Structures are given as C-alpha cells and as structure tokens.
Amino acid sequence: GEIAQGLKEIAKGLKEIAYGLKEIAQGLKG
Amino acid sequence: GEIAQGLKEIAKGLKEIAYGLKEIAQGLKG
Amino acid sequence: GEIAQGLKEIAKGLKEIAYGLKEIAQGLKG
Amino acid sequence: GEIAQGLKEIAKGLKEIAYGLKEIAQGLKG
Amino acid sequence: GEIAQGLKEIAKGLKEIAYGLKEIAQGLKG
Amino acid sequence: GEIAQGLKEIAKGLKEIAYGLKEIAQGLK
C-alpha cells in the first residue's frame, strides 16, 4: 500500500539524485 | 499511516536535494 | 511511533541539505 | 529499523556530498 | 532485507562520491 | 523485489560516477 508507494517515491528521488550527480561530474570535466 | 507519511516526507527531501544538485550542475556549465 | 518520528527527523535533515545545495547553486550563478 | 538506518546513512552521504560541492565552488571562484 | 541492503549500497556509493568531490576540491585549492 | 533491484541498479550507477570523479581529481593532481 502506501508503505510500498513511499519506498517507490524514495527510489525515484534517489534516481534523480544519481542523475544530478552525473550532470555535476559532466560539468566538472568541462 | 505515519510510516508511509515519514517515507513520503523523505522522498520529498530527496527530490529537493535532486533539484539542488541539478541547479549546481547548471551553475558549473554556465 | 518512534520509527515514524525517526523518519520525519531524517526528512527534516534532508530538507536542510537541499537548502544548502540551493545556496551553492545561487553562489555559482552570482 | 533497517530501512530507516539505510536512509540515515544516505542522508550522511548527501551531507558529505554537499560539503564537497561547497568546497569545489569555493575553489572554482578562487 | 534486500531493500535495506540496496539503501546501504546507495549510501556507500554516495560516500565514495563525497570523497571524490572532496579530492577535486583539494586539487583546485592546491 | 523490483524496488530492491532498482536500488541496486542506482548503486551500480553511483560507482560509475565515483570513478569519473576520481579521473577528474587525478587530472588536477
């Protein structure tokens, strides 16, 4: 139920964090 | 329920973090 | 519940991290 | 309990990331 | 549980990222 | 389950990022 939904939203947030960190690493290369 | 609510609040915090990381990447590229 | 309270405390800390990341982004833009 | 512990460790990692980004931004302005 | 294990693996990865960012900061300052 | 699998895949991606950041750091120093 909403526990599984809460964990799926956490996973989505972590995926978006990962993608921001990728963008940061790209920016630091040039 | 309050476990689900706490998990969704964490997810909200993670998504806010992802927004800040993306903005940092934007700032590195510009 | 103590677990729900702990999860809300985590969420509070994450939101504080988010604000600091937005500060870093603002400083990179000027 | 184990899920909350994982989330607290994630929050610690994100706090460390934010510190490293602030130090990077200072170094890029220097 | 495997969800807690995945969250702890993400925390380890985030801490590794934090160390690389700090090394980048140190390299810009030195 | 699918949540655990997705989290493990995120963790794999974070290791890739860490190793890009290592390359950057060593290129400065």
Numbering used by the authors:
A (entry chain C), B (entry chain B), C (entry chain A), D (entry chain F), E (entry chain E): 1 to 30
F (entry chain D): 1 to 29
Question: What wording appears in the published article?
Answer:
Expanding this pattern to hpphhph can produce larger α-helical barrels. Here, we show that pentameric to nonameric barrels are accessed by varying the residue at one of the h sites. In peptides with four L/I–K–E–I–A–x–Z repeats, decreasing the size of Z from threonine to serine to alanine to glycine gives progressively larger oligomers. X-ray crystal structures of the resulting α-helical barrels rationalize this: side chains at Z point directly into the helical interfaces, and smaller residues allow closer helix contacts and larger assemblies.
The Gly@g peptide with a = Leu, d = Ile crystallized in two forms. Although there are natural nonameric protein assemblies, this is the first stand-alone, water-soluble α-helical CC of this size. The second crystal form revealed a collapsed C2-symmetric 6-helix bundle. We posit that the small size of Gly relaxes this design rule allowing access to other nearby regions of the CC free-energy landscape. The first challenge is incorporating multistate design into αHBs, i.e. considering multiple conformations and/or assemblies that may become accessible in the CC free-energy landscape. However, this becomes difficult with increasing off-target states, e.g. collapsed and anti-parallel structures.
